[PDB]
Ligand SMILES: Cc1cc2nc3c(=O)[nH]c(=O)nc-3n(C[C@H](O)[C@H](O)[C@H](O)COP(=O)(O)OP(=O)(O)OC[C@H]3O[C@@H](n4cnc5c(N)ncnc54)[C@H](O)[C@@H]3O)c2cc1C
């Protein structure tokens with residue numbers, strides 16, 4: 001006799017996917033979102049008269065779950081200008097910037113990446129079962145920097161691969177766990193060209209908020225925003241959910257999809273398992289932020305890397321024309337490295353990378369400052385991947401989802417969608433009337 | 441008003457996927473299956489005390505739709521012994537058999553395959569929009585053999601790649617359209633290692649019938665077996681479907697998922713578009729069949745190619761042990777080349793590739809003989825891919841699905857599932 005059959009906490013892709021599965025099963029589904037908006041770590045906004053993505057933006061057909069969703073809801077891709085580049089730059093730790101011909105830039109980053117993932121085939125023959133091989137659990141004691149040191153690359157190759165890996169870490173490469181990178185590379189077909197195509201090339205048509213809205217509208221679930229959940233208590237046959245205004249909402253099952261780094265805001269009765277509590281105390285590495293810069297000059301199609309001691313770690317063209325100028329999509333590995341609020345400062349840094357450009361605008365999202373992300377994409381530290389199931393395991397009638405809890409594209413939208421599907425399966429298992437299956 | 445909201449004709453992966461989408465949308469969904477079994481061109485059966493797949497068998501995580509379904513319904517994979525091979529054989533057109541070192545076999549087939557798809561990246565940057573580039577459009581005037589001739593391969597490499605392409609054609613390579621092959625290679629990440637990993641390595645746990653049963657059970661739809669559909673007639677706001685016992689079932693919308701080569705068995709009133717009728721009259725190339733052989737000796741992990749003029753085109757180990765022996769999974773490009781019901785004849789052909797094998801058993805499925813498949817996997821002839829839209833286009837309140845109508849893995853289960861998702865979306869558009 002609970003208020004709802006299932007309550008999904010979080011309006012991200014994991015929460016929307018879970019709510020859609022549960023909703024189309026006929027359950028009474030309620031979704032609670034702490035922010036006043038949906039999308040979670042994806043954020044569709046506006047800047048310089050265009051639609052932009054402050055968070056997750058790019059998907060690919062080699063990512064199975066999100067692509068299946070796009071086929072279901074009839075969404076294709078929108079291509080960003082990543083081919084036929086006009087300029088390619090590398091900024092080293094000292095701040096010097098070197099312009100390289102795009103062809104040799106691509107060949108060097110290809111060589112560096114493929115040498116860093118030389119054993120991806122043998123370590124991860126099944127990327128969606130990450131602990132399948134004993135050499136993978138055994139390589140969870142090493143960082144990305146540890147391998148980079150043994151690669152023996154050129155100065156430019158090491159700078160590029162360290163910029164890539166620092167960006168994916170949201171931190172310096174000494175803290176970044178190696179198996180997660182090997183596993184993501186394996187997810188993209190064990191081939192650098194395809195994997196690179198998966199990461200920053202194609203956006204969702206109508207925006208990520210379009211797919212979120214498609215799933216939640218299809219679900220028929222009730223969606224409540226500006227309702228943060230502060231505590232969850234398991235009772236017999238159900239759960240009691242308490243919000244920051246102390247209401248009580250009772251449910252048969254609750255699916256937790258909040259980011260790992262935010263679990264400290266919610267109290268659980270009884271306390272979670274020691275493994276899950278340890279994961280909550282370590283959290284996840286990324287400290288990233290996203291910045292868009294509108295410049296009056298037309299720079300064409302530009303791509304740039306910047307090493308971990310510089311702020312503009314990933315630079316890419318969003319749109320360009322004589323009329324417009326250029327809109328730059330920039331991803332920052334660590335928010336500490338730049339005051340994205342001091343716009344002389346970001347202008348100085350931009351002009352440090354592109355000399356003499358007049359800046360017309362920027363807009364930036366600091367995912368570290370947001371109390372409901374407290375970090376950016378999922379980035380596993382050393383030794384964390386091996387304990388991943390400790391995060392996935394259900395605790396009573398509390399299910400756990402989110403990109404951090406996925407087996408495949410854990411740093412991506414696809415991982416969130418996957419965890420949402422798994423959450424829907426487990427919800428069906430708990431609310432199942434005749435045939436009850438809960439293996440592992 | 442009508443008997444049902446939606447009627448899905450066909451109990452394959454496309455039909456089961458469509459029935460699942462429509463069923464969980466709340467429509468009253470009825471699915472009609474001509475055979476007494478489900479699965480369509482996949483068939484989970486038994487042989488030599490083991491589970492076997494007479495049709496579609498192998499899936500991969502680089503195939504998005506079927507992998508998403510496996511994630512939803514909690515199905516893992518079963519690995520077949522395809523790595524660390526013990527023997528690799530090539531049988532040329534003359535019937536001579538040559539044993540190659542597995543490493544040299546692997547990079548010879550790698551070289552041939554990657555030279556065959558050297559432009560796959562340019563031509564298909566978006567494999568799920570096959571006509572995105574204009575060079576795909578006019579590489580649709582070429583056969584796969586046309587390119588193989590320009591590759592200038594070795595004897596061995598040409599034998600291997602022509603055996604591969606002949607099996608994927610279900611026909612000789614001179615009739616096989618090139619862009620479909622380039623597009624499938626593009627779907628697997630433009631890389632031969634990944635693409636080969638997608639095709640014959642991993643089966644579904646619990647079998648393909650397990651996934652079909654998961655989808656249809658989830659759907660809540662009504663399923664009728666041994667009910668072939670003979671005619672479809674459009675009235676306003678609905679469709680009239682007539683079975684082979686002359687009952688009439690009225691529906692708001694009908695989803696056709698039957699194989700292309702069987703469309704001659706169904707009359708449409710009004711008649712379909714001239715493009716669709718053209719596709720129905722050309723059909724699709726494949727003439728393949730599948731054969732399992734039980735031998736007393738343990739050959740270990742074996743893989744073998746046979747060129748288009750020999751019958752045992754694709755050979756690989758299904759299971760092996762000293763007590764068991766060996767169970768061989770063999771795919772035959774053209775059923776004409778071997779009489780799979782004469783156990784003695786196929787014993788001779790098996791013994792031609794592995795000399796001195798005592799054969800303990802056989803089991804075979806002839807997909808050409810089945811009136812409800814009349815062919816095997818989807819295989820596009822020259823120029824057919826360019827008209828793919830003609831097959832996909834809806835005609836009134838009749839929607840069309842099936843692996844032949846998919847944009848991606850058209851020769852696979854994943855293509856059928858994709859077409860089922862699109863069919864569900866179009867049903868949602870019509871009934872809202
Ligand atoms: C800048 C950036 C770039 C990235 N780029 C890409 C990319 O290009 N492609 C890609 O695939 N992925 C990308 N990622 C990763 C990605 O977008 C995430 O993996 C994905 O959005 C995770 O979704 P989620 O549902 O698992 O979690 P979230 O999206 O964070 O959802 C959790 C939800 O829970 C809410 N919440 C938190 N606490 C509470 C509480 N106490 N009560 C109620 N609600 C609460 C939050 O508001 C949020 O809505 C990027 C992420 C960022 C931030």
Ligand SMILES: Cc1cc2nc3c(=O)[nH]c(=O)nc-3n(C[C@H](O)[C@H](O)[C@H](O)COP(=O)(O)OP(=O)(O)OC[C@H]3O[C@@H](n4cnc5c(N)ncnc54)[C@H](O)[C@@H]3O)c2cc1C
Pocket residue numbers: 449450451452453454455472473474475478479480481482494495496497498499639640667668669670697698699702705706728729730771807812813815816817818841842843844850851852853854855856
């Ligand atoms: C030997 C073989 C090997 C292959 N191997 C693989 C593989 O390893 N991996 C892979 O992914 N794919 C493989 N394929 C291809 C594959 O299995 C098909 O792509 C897929 O099953 C297509 O499904 P479908 O729903 O589109 O059509 P079908 O599976 O053929 O379903 C159509 C249904 O319609 C029914 N039907 C026909 N006419 C009528 C009528 N008039 N009235 C009512 N019903 C009718 C049929 O009985 C059938 O059940 C293989 C196929 C075969 C045969």
Ligand SMILES: CN1CCC[C@H]1c1cccnc1
Pocket residue numbers: 167168199200314331377411412
């Ligand atoms: C998609 N990627 C996965 C994690 C980070 C994210 C990314 C990569 C490059 C630039 N910005 C964001």
Ligand SMILES: CN1CCC[C@H]1c1cccnc1
Pocket residue numbers: 607608639640754771817851852
């Ligand atoms: C799955 N493949 C796709 C089309 C044919 C089919 C196949 C390939 C190799 C051996 N048997 C069947």
